[PDB]
């Protein structure tokens, strides 16, 4: 009775999983509202909390559990299936139960992931402006060899205005926009020169507290498909650098139109993992 969300076959993650590559030996950190570790479809093997009074393995918001499910929901005969179901999943709590976060909280989480041997970082979060400490943190993570992925933003389009937020706007970070089930750009998906790739972000069905599921919209939903795709590539080719994984994702993307609206296009992990 396992549910396969449309996003899994759309990015061709089912084709890579059928090859026997499911993210084994790859460590992915989800920097978010935490993860409901007690959810049957999620195996959280570590992490850290930078939110006072809250442990990393609980999620009082829901957002982080949903994002984690897209990356890593277990391949079992029930529940939902994630992009890279054999990944080692780490919950890095940088957002509180209301969804809000500080720059120091996000920096602390980025640094923890870098120091703790994470292969991939997912950041389904953003702001209109970044900070010197955040730019340093993502530059260090990427230089160390971490594939850094973030939601581009949900500010849509307004003529020629660049609507990409931070950390997605940083050169060291992959900015991910959103498409629907017909591979059309979602109207809310942010646009700009920094837009790198697209992934499913409309009506994404995933894990949600407590022991349930939810259908959500956002570039927050698109970002984990790319983080998960990076992990599938790395389980197949473990010796690749972060730059090499990043170029594999952008160079093999399905062209959809102008780079301003779609970046390189929709990720195709089967082609990326060749």
């Amino acid at each position: 009775a396992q549910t396969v969300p449309y996003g899994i076959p759309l990015i061709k993650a089912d084709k890579v999983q059928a090859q026997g590559f499911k993210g084994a030996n790859v460590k992915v950190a989800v920097l978010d509202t935490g993860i409901q570790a007690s959810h049957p479809d999620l195996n959280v093997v570590g992490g850290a909390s930078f939110v006072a009074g809250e442990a990393y393995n609980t999620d009082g918001n829901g957002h982080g559990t949903h994002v984690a499910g897209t990356v890593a929901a277990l391949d079992n005969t029930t529940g939902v299936l994630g992009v890279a179901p054999s990944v080692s999943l780490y919950a890095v709590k940088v957002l509180n139960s209301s969804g809000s976060g500080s720059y120091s909280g996000i920096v602390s989480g980025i640094e923890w992931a870098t120091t703790n041997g994470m292969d991939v970082i997912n950041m389904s979060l953003g702001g209109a402006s970044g900070s010197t400490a955040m730019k340093q943190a993502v530059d260090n993570a990427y230089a160390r060899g971490v594939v850094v992925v973030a939601a581009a933003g949900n500010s849509g389009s307004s003529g020629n205005t660049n609507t990409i937020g931070y950390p997605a706007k940083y050169d060291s970070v992959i900015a991910v926009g959103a498409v629907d089930s017909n591979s059309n750009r979602a109207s809310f998906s942010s646009v700009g020169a920094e837009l790198e790739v697209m992934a499913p972000g409309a009506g994404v069905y995933s894990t949600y507290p407590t022991n349930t599921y939810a259908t959500l919209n956002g570039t927050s939903m698109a970002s984990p498909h790319v983080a998960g795709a990076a992990a599938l590539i790395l389980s197949k080719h473990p010796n690749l650098s972060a730059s090499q994984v990043r170029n594999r994702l952008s160079s093999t993307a399905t062209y959809l139109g102008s780079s301003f609206y779609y970046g390189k296009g929709l990720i195709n992990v089967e082609a990326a993992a060749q």
């Binding site: 957002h63 969804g99 720059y103 702001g127 972000g201 959500l216 939903m221 970002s223």
Partner: protein
Amino acid sequence: CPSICPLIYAPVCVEDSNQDFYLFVNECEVRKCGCEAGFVYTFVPREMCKATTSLCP
């Protein structure tokens, strides 16, 4: 005041102190605007807003 929000798209319509209507990408963004800028708002039905989103005025 919290500077970072999740990138969930769950738009909400608010009415400012100057009686103008703004559609924010989510409740977190409305709260951020209120905290950082001292912005005054009240939630109202979606129909009061334009179909497109606005940033913190």
